[PDB]
Amino acid sequence: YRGVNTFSPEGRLFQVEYAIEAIKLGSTAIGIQTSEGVCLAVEKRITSPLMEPSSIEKIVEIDAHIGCAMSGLIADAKTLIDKARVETQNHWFTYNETMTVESVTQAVSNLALQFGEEDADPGAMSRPFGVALLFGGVDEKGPQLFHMDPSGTFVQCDARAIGSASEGAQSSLQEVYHKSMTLKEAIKSSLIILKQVMEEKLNATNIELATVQPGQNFHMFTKEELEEVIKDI
Amino acid sequence: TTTLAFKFRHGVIVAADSRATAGAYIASQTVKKVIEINPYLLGTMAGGAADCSFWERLLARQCRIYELRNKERISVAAASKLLANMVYQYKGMGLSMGTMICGWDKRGPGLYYVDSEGNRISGATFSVGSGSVYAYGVMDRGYSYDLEVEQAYDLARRAIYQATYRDAYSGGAVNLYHVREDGWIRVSSDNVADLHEKYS
Amino acid sequence: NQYDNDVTVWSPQGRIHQIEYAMEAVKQGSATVGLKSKTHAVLVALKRAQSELAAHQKKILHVDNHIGISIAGLTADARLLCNFMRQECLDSRFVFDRPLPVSRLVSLIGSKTQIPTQRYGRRPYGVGLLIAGYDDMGPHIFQTCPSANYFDCRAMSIGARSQSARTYLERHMSEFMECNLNELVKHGLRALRETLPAEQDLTTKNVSIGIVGKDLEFTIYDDDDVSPFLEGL
Amino acid sequence: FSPYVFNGGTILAIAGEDFAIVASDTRLSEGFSIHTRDSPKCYKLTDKTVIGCSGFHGDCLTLTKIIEARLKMYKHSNNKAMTTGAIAAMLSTILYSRRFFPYYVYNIIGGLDEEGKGAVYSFDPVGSYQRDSFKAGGSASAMLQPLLDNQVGFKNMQNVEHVPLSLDRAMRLVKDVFISAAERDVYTGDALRICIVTKEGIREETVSLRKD
Amino acid sequence: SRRYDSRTTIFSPEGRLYQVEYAMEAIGHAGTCLGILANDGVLLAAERRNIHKLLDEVFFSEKIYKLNEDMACSVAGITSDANVLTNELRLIAQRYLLQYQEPIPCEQLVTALCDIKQAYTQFGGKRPFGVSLLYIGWDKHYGFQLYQSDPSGNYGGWKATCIGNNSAAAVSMLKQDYKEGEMTLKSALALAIKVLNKTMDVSKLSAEKVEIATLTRENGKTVIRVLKQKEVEQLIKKHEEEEAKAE
Amino acid sequence: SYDRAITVFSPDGHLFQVEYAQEAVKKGSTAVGVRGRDIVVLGVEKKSVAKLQDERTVRKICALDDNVCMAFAGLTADARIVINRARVECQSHRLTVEDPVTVEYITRYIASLKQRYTQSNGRRPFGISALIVGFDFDGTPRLYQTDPSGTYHAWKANAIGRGAKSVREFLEKNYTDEAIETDDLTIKLVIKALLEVVQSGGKNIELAVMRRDQSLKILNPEEIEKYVAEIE
Amino acid sequence: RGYSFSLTTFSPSGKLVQIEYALAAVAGGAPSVGIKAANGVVLATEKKQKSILYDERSVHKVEPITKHIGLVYSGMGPDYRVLVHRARKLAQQYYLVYQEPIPTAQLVQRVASVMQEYTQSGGVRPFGVSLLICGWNEGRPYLFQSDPSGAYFAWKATAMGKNYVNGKTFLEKRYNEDLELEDAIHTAILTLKESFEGQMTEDNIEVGICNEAGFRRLTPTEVKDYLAA
Amino acid sequence: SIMSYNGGAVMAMKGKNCVAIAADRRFGIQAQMVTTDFQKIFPMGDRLYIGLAGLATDVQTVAQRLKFRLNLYELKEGRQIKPYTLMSMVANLLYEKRFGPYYTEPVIAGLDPKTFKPFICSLDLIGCPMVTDDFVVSGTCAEQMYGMCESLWEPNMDPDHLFETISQAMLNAVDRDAVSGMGVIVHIIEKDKITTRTLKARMD
Amino acid sequence: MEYLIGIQGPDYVLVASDRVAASNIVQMKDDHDKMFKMSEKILLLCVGEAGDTVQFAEYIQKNVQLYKMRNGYELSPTAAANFTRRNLADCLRSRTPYHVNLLLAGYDEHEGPALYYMDYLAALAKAPFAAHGYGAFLTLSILDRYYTPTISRERAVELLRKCLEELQKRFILNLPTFSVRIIDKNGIHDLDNISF
């Protein structure tokens, strides 16, 4: 009944729509693009105190100049991250160059949606990935921020918010952000919107933050560095 | 071709010549036989140049994937086992490769020798190439573990110079490297004519 | 109810419903246009952005030095079809050292899109293309629908609200064969404007133009590069 | 049944401060006979790159077609034209894909780098490659390299300042070395083709050589 | 085709595999099986269901199966799935023997078969095997052994068990009247005769509606035997005599 | 080959097969885990001796590598499959990397296998949840929990299975630096927490303890009863 | 491609229903009989064609496998043909490997195992046939039955098909372990006669025997002679 | 040659209700003894055995594989194999590898399980049965063994005379073979008993 | 070539091997190890073609450790030896043989010490004493001349001394330091190396 690859009377794959619904269960992640760099902020969402907050790897680096932030399922990302990384490295191997951001987003996007039931592979993928990613990095073209959806649709964004509170977060990001921000101001605005959404009171322990700039490689904010930003925040 | 590398109190030094030959014809005197796998791993090239470069570059890609997955750098032993397992799938199929992998791991400075026939060992000092036999004597007589940094530099340079002198297939310039806790550096690239002038 | 769950289940009226739903998916996309004169062929497109901070989605791609397309529908399907077209054109150049005639490429496209709609569990390509090319027989414009049915048009307009565009096109079909490149591009822009919803004007931020001709490889105009074409409307 | 056959030809590239030259003869031969007289060995890849192929002619032809296809593929996918380093790396990979049935082709790339300077890359048939300031390959490599080393490199000559290599002196040296190669090498010497890669674009010049 | 698919390998809305549950429901109607591990033997006591005057006597048994020189098993469920599983068990034993030149230990074997069964109930779209096994054997690791398996793929070592019809009642007496570590082979056989006489409520042990097996070590090597008619009837006469004296 | 899509998305975005897998996980005996200064301890609940099962063939805490162990709660056959797969991967890691495996690596591997079976064709998700404990080469104590969806986290004290909410609340109220100072205090803490679901204790529990180099410790019934008494 | 899912599945009562329906089809066929005499084994079925236009010799129901073992059925026809072919092939494979005639117990085991596969395999339905095999292996007669479920039973004497319950009652009345071949075949002929609905002409029944001499069908003149009594 | 790599010999003889089968003990690599305790005749039934001369790896592999097949057969049929069926079994096992064969030349010897009527036969390395009524030989010293058997063989010999004759042939064919020997181990098969004797053989 | 020697006693098993990794007129290593530790009570000595040896040894070692860890108990010496022989034989006739000559040792609670000899053609043998390589030709006769079934352990070390010193005298290659190891009921011990 109602195969995976089926078209609704509106012209939408059902499985794709349901996959787009699963992105609301996920925590809220933000990304802002500025000339001085691009920043990622996400909510770790510590359910109970008993668990190590450091063990929620919910931002990872694809390359020294790329960064990824996700929302949706934990398990669904892992394969997309590995694909993104092996593609970056493959490009470096062949061309001795650095894989651009739009290209890694495109490759990851293609890898999505190649799901089916009939005559594919001994173990090919069945249902669409239920995760929405955020690629941000510095390329030969400067700071970039790209947003991906389970439909294999990707677009470069100036500021985007994905996750359970993506609406409202987006209105805030739209009211604040302008074309001439600074990286530090971007961190401040992002942390403030996050604080505004999370149920819990913001602290250095229940978030992660990462920025990538032309000079420094992808950077993870440390507990003390997080406190330093949050105190004035 | 002559390549050289020895562990000692202060790290692992690397030195090599820069000559390529096609029969009796000198194809280039500016090759880079010290391959730079990463900021912490080095690899020399002996035998088939294309094989060494291609397989060492695959190793670099694998190491980067590993450090990116686990969040920690690969060991010298792990990198070497990976190369050996990569080339053993072509035993008796015509590959030529002779390499020393060297870095600074959690176990300290490391130096592994990997070949195309499948060998993989660790040692204090190595030298592989056509001028290897001409360099082993100079190393063995001069080598010491507690040897100072300047003294280690001198020993490596003299060994490669002597190998160049007595061997018809090795020559050019002697590049020399240092491998430390922070990573490797490049020390000098001294032409053999200048070294002849210095030692005579 | 039970005749619109699979693509291999004929409906008692001689209609396959899944193919029609795929047509719907193609009709829900943003507007696009195509023209041909005796000398050139021009595509004119209308990108749209999910939010006010995100970019407007690319909807013209390259195939060869003498062919171009303009998509409308699920992107992933469009990307798959672009891959196919480019591989076919490259194979023609490698084997025959010669550009692939356009008609043959459209035929291969139709045949490739035909297999899905006759096997159980596979689904129609939910994308609608507008191929513009220039062969030894001169300019060409084609259209492709999810049903593997291609059309040799002289002007068309697929996508959402595209019917007013088609009306304007059928209105001025006499001039297209004698027009200059500028007049042709202005006809296309004007129609795609007829498609726009009242209080919304053509801007550099929501238009892209493609052109191919006798001594002119396929080239894409977008962003400020489109301003010279827009200035004059 | 031997699948290869040696087809002669020589190719030469020398890099400068703001230019690159790739040059070749235009003879094709098989055994003691001479196939044609207008077969240039230097092919244009991008607006700042040129590559010369010598060796087995079928392998040369297949390889250059493969290169053009790969370059088109890359442009489509990454939305920018390749650089000289990108083509060098891609060709090292293509060639090693046949370690066990190698191309019998000697390749030498020449163009401009991303900062506007010259770059020259040489290749072994199996893929190994290295960056250099001047290289020659083919039938007259052995009799071409030493003179370039003497004049461009200023080797073995003392009390002579190391003047930079201008474009005029480069063209002259290329022409002269090709005259000598034609004088003392049967496989080459039909007509000289010179491609000059610079910031404005690629120019072509031709010079006639002695037929036999 | 999804219309005719049965989905024999998918979870229910409370995390229970239904096809497995029904498979175990089939077993609860086939012949009863009994396990008793003595200190000097192991013994299988199932009921002979093929009770007709027009059946012929063939083979050394009808429900007991040899698997190696040092291992045997009895079956409850479908006869045909039983044959398939027995064949695969024999193959596993011989493959281990070929690789190591040592007889396959008992939990080596039982877990190999149960792994096949579990995999079969995990993916593939087939129906699961409706068989539950009882095994017996000796190996230098744990001595005399008595295992059991189920359609799920779970097994268990049992000092005494019962899989099949009236399993609850048989295990109830087996709990009431088992001396852990204080059982000779003879006492275990008598306990089996008693428990079965209860369970096979239809008439009494006819010495022909029953099957008994013994695994022992004799002269340093395993010896497997299926009790003949005379000894079985003598045991039953002894049982009735003991019960009569008891009353 | 059978190539139907068992696990499939549903309106409102739910993997019902995954949800039913964890509903199965909720039908297994409670397992517990705590992390101390220098000792980890795994605690399970035995359903019943039955006086006729051989508890040796019924083990519920298993070792994957000399320095890594695991406990599960759910179906048994799936647990056996995952344990064997993890064992193979630990040994392959030893052979290729020449360094001992680490707890996060194997937890990641097991979680990936679960996700794979959750997104493949013709495959039913594992209805098992794991608790991996151990010490890396650096000698740091570690505790990870893997759900049937393929998600994993690190914990100081989590309980998995039947009655998990109660035991998790108990550990969350009680876990403090005081209770990990003495290895006996930690063992007794785990015993007490378990003792909020099980009835008998001593003959109705199993324990496991592991130290830096000390191999896996199985606590015998007499010693466990003595530990409960000392708690008494 | 082909369905990769089993079409026989367990029911809530733990019964594979499709096998039950196959058994129903078997019980609704033509009668059949088999007895194991002390010095031979006899099979016999009924072949009542539908009109005078059917060639009795066109096809046979009692078919041999080798020179010394043969079988008959009751159920559907085409399934019986398939199983005859598979049995002959398995017999020839056994002979090729072992260079000795296949024992009846093993051929029955092998054909039955082939019968199980179709109860569980994907996209297939059970055979609607039960067979009886007769052999003379090890100087000793053998009589086996094999049903759609893949189960086999060794029989001293049996009767399957339509009205098989009454036939089994008859045979229970008339078995005597010291029976002789001619008496056994006579008793069989009777059992078929217990319910037949007509006159048993020579051209409306079949029989086949096995002894030391070898399994071999009976020619109709022989059948008429035996039917004389 | 390949057979000479490890040497080795086997023999089989017949008598009145008995059969004998003998093989040497040496195992070496070209011209160096490695052990004098190598086993070549393999137990295969109550009164059925099998000897294999040729390559030691192949002797061991074939013995293990054949025991695998025979074990499965007996456990699936509930009866011991009879000699002829075993011979056909080995013939199919060897012939399955007609291209890339096993390098052994098996000899079979065992009384029937019911009439106890003698039976010996020999097989090529690609499965050619050869049944005789007097004797069969195989190994590297085959010709010496023919010379001895023809002269020392007579029909209807009791177990004592048979054992003497077969031992004499075995010892006297080894002494003139340089790469087989250092011990002879004899099996004598009768209806009731099995006798295994080791003979005083030159160790040179 | 490489050298191996094993002497088996009523309680122990003594094993040794050279510590050289020469490659074309150059002794590239002096402290190499040809001994692999199968388990806590089984060892594996391996010599053969460069590259094949370590691969085959690591494969077998991994499988044996995985067995021990899957089951709760370790494989026996004889079972492990037959497993290894079966793998070598199976690979013999494939597209990728292993050129490996092996000396396996181990102890068992019942059978006792186990020294197992195996050549590269997949022939197995159990012997009181065995050897491999070219040195076998210059040390086997000594083992025959001064070996008794009940030989004490110290006498075993002395006998191996005779063998190594003869290998020094009459051989052609240079084996300046050797490995020595003994397995007993109490595990494995590494004895100090016999050198000159």
Which residues in chain D are contacts of A101 at CB distance < 8 A? none
Q: Which of H74, H75, H81, H85 to mutate to test the interface with G (most CBs of G within 10 A)?
A: H85
**Is the torsion defined by CA of I149, I152, I154, I155 positive or negative?**
negative
Tokens found for residue B67: 């450090």
Q: Which residues of B are annotated as a binding site for bortezomib?
A: 49
- Residues A160 and C54: beta-carbon distance below 8 Å: yes
Q: Three-state DSSP class for I66?
A: helix
Last residue before each gap in chain A (C to N over 2.5 A): none
Q: Solved how?
A: cryo-EM
Asked if D127 lies within 8 A of B30 by C-beta distance, the reply is no
Chains E and G form CB pairs within 8 A to the count of 100
Distance CA A104, CA A84 (A): 6
DSSP A88-135: HHHHHHHHSS---HHHHHHHHHHHTT---SSSS-TT---SPP--EEEE
| Chains touching H, CB cut-off 8 Å, 3+ pairs | E, G, I
Q: How many CB atoms lie within 10 A of CB B142?
A: 15
Is residue B1 part of the annotated active site? The answer reads: yes
Asked if F105 lies within 8 A of B81 by C-beta distance, the reply is no
Q: Which of H2, H36, H61 to mutate to test the interface with I (most CBs of I within 10 A)?
A: H61
Distance CA G152, CA G164 (A): 17
Distances (CA, A) of H68 to B160, D9, H71: 62, 67, 5
Distance from CA of E51 to the nearest CA of F (A): 32
Distance CA F197, CA F167 (A): 8
Which residue is closest to D71 within chain A, CA to CA? A95
Query: What amino acid occupies position C14?
Result: G
Distance CA G108, CA G148 (A): 13
- Structural domains in chain F (count): 1
Asked if G154 lies within 8 A of E55 by C-beta distance, the reply is yes
The residue segments making up the domain with residue I31 are 1-196
Count of helix runs (H) and strand runs (E) in chain H: 4, 12
Residue G87 phi/psi, 5-degree rounding, is: -65, -45
- Structural domains in chain I (count): 1
| CA C231 remoteness from chain centre | 24
| CA I80 remoteness from chain centre | 14
Domain holding F162: CATH number?
3.60.20.10
| Chains touching F, CB cut-off 8 Å, 3+ pairs | A, B, E, G, I
Distance CA B45, CA F212 (A): 42
Helix (H) or strand (E) holding H73: helix H56-77
- Residues D182 and D169: beta-carbon distance below 8 Å: no
- Residues C100 and C89: beta-carbon distance below 8 Å: yes
Query: In terms of C-beta distances under 8 Å and separation of at least 24 residues, what long-range contacts does D36-40 make, across chains too?
Result: D37/D190, D37/D191, D37/D211, D38/D190, D38/D191, D39/D9, D40/D193
Distance CA H130, CA H113 (A): 21
Q: Which residues contact E4 (CB under 8 A, 6 or more apart)?
A: G3, G5, G7
Domain holding E45: CATH number?
3.60.20.10
Domain holding D192: CATH number?
3.60.20.10
Resolution in A: 2.9
Minimal Cβ distance to G11: which of E5, E22, E54 = E22
Distance from CA of C124 to the nearest CA of A (A): 9
Is some CB atom of chain I closer than 8 A to the CB atom of F215? no
Angle at A122 between CA A120 and CA A128, to 5 degrees: 55
Which residue is closest to A48 within chain F, CA to CA? F172
Is some CB atom of chain E closer than 8 A to the CB atom of H35? no
Q: Which residues contact D101 (CB under 8 A, 6 or more apart)?
A: none
DSSP assigned state of B180? -
Is some CB atom of chain I closer than 8 A to the CB atom of B118? yes
Per the document, the length of chain I is 196
Distance CA D129, CA D93 (A): 10
Shortest CA distance to F4 belongs to which of B10, E6, C107? Answer: E6
Helix (H) or strand (E) holding E44: strand E42-46
Q: Three-state DSSP class for D118?
A: strand
Tokens found for residue E148: 């059991």
H-helix segments, A136-217: 166-176, 183-197
Asked if H68 lies within 8 A of E59 by C-beta distance, the reply is no
- Residues B118 and B88: beta-carbon distance below 8 Å: yes
Angle at E28 between CA E24 and CA E33, to 5 degrees: 110
Distance CA B159, CA B106 (A): 30
Which residues in chain I are contacts of F81 at CB distance < 8 A? none
| CA D155 remoteness from chain centre | 23
Q: Which of H62, H66, H71, H73 to mutate to test the interface with E (most CBs of E within 10 A)?
A: H71
Q: Three-state DSSP class for E164?
A: coil
Among residues B1, B2, B125, B164, which one is catalytic?
Answer: B1
The residue segments making up the domain with residue C103 are 1-233
Chains F and G form CB pairs within 8 A to the count of 6
Tokens found for residue F104: 């996060």
Three-state helix/strand/coil letters over chain F: CCCCCCCCCCCCCCCHHHHHHHHHHCCCCCEEEEECCCCEEEEECCCCCCCCECHHHHCCEEEEECCEEEEEEECHHHHHHHHHHHHHHHHHHHHHHCCCCCHHHHHHHHHHHHHHHHHCCCECCCCEEEEEEEECCCCCEEEEEECCCCCEEEECEEEECCCHHHHHHHHHHHCCHHHHCCHHHHHHHHHHHHCCCCCCCCCCCEEEEECCCCCCEECCHHHHHHHHHHHC
The residue segments making up the domain with residue H189 are 1-204
| CA I168 remoteness from chain centre | 20
The residue segments making up the domain with residue D36 are 1-212
- Residues A161 and A170: beta-carbon distance below 8 Å: yes
Half-sphere exposure (CA, 13 Å, Cβ side) for B143?
20
Shortest CA distance to F74 belongs to which of F140, F132, F142, F130? Answer: F130
Distance CA F9, CA F19 (A): 12
Asked if I82 lies within 8 A of E101 by C-beta distance, the reply is yes
Is some CB atom of chain B closer than 8 A to the CB atom of A76? no
Provide the b/e sequence for B24-57 (b: ≥16 CB within 10 Å). Answer: eebbbbebebbbebbebbbbbbbbbbbbbbbbbb
DSSP E61-72: -SSEEEEETTEE
Distance from CA of H131 to the nearest CA of G (A): 14
Strands (DSSP E) found in chain D: 10-15, 19-25, 28-30, 33-36, 42-46, 49-55, 105-112, 118-123, 129-132, 134-138, 191-198, 202-208
Q: Which residues contact F9 (CB under 8 A, 6 or more apart)?
A: A15, A18, A19, A22, A127, A128, A130, F15
Which residues in chain H are contacts of G106 at CB distance < 8 A? 76-77
| Chains touching I, CB cut-off 8 Å, 3+ pairs | B, E, F, H
Q: Which of F55, F82, F91, F98 to mutate to test the interface with I (most CBs of I within 10 A)?
A: F91
Is some CB atom of chain G closer than 8 A to the CB atom of E244? no
Shortest CA distance to I118 belongs to which of I107, I132, I128, I108? Answer: I132
Distance CA F173, CA F176 (A): 9
Shortest CA distance to F34 belongs to which of F223, F177, F152, F215? Answer: F177
Which residue is closest to E17 within chain F, CA to CA? F24
Distance CA F177, CA E147 (A): 46
Query: What amino acid occupies position G30?
Result: A
Shortest CA distance to H10 belongs to which of H174, H195, H152, H194? Answer: H174
- Residues G48 and G204: beta-carbon distance below 8 Å: yes
Q: How many CB atoms lie within 10 A of CB A228?
A: 13
Residue A207 phi/psi, 5-degree rounding, is: -155, 165
| CA E66 remoteness from chain centre | 12
Is some CB atom of chain C closer than 8 A to the CB atom of D78? no
Instruction: Give the residue carrying structure tokens 């052995």.
Output: D142
Helix (H) or strand (E) holding I118: strand I113-118
Three-state helix/strand/coil letters over G159-202: EECCCHHHHHHHHHHHCCCCCCHHHHHHHHHHHHHHCCCCCCCH
| CA H2 remoteness from chain centre | 19
- Residues F147 and F15: beta-carbon distance below 8 Å: no
Sheet containing strand C155-156, edge to edge, reads C155-156, C32-36, C40-45, C208-213, C216-222
Distance from CA of E66 to the nearest CA of H (A): 7
- Residues G115 and E81: beta-carbon distance below 8 Å: no
- Residues E205 and E45: beta-carbon distance below 8 Å: no
Instruction: Give the CATH number of domain G1-229.
Output: 3.60.20.10
- Structural domains in chain H (count): 1
Helix (H) or strand (E) holding B57: helix B49-70
Is some CB atom of chain E closer than 8 A to the CB atom of A7? no
Helix (H) or strand (E) holding H150: helix H142-152
Angle at E199 between CA E196 and CA E200, to 5 degrees: 85
H-helix segments, chain G: 17-27, 77-98, 104-120, 164-174, 181-194, 220-228
The residue segments making up the domain with residue F122 are 1-232
Distance CA A158, CA A177 (A): 9
Which residues in chain A are contacts of B58 at CB distance < 8 A? 93
- Residues A131 and A73: beta-carbon distance below 8 Å: yes
Q: Does domain B1-200 have CATH number 3.40.1550.10?
A: no
Shortest CA distance to E63 belongs to which of E163, E170, E152? Answer: E163
Q: Three-state DSSP class for I92?
A: helix
Distance CA H129, CA H107 (A): 10
Is some CB atom of chain B closer than 8 A to the CB atom of D96? yes
Asked if C93 lies within 8 A of D73 by C-beta distance, the reply is no
Q: How many CB atoms lie within 10 A of CB C94?
A: 13
Q: Three-state DSSP class for A233?
A: coil
The burial class, CB within 10 Å (0-12 / 13-18 / 19+), for I47 is buried
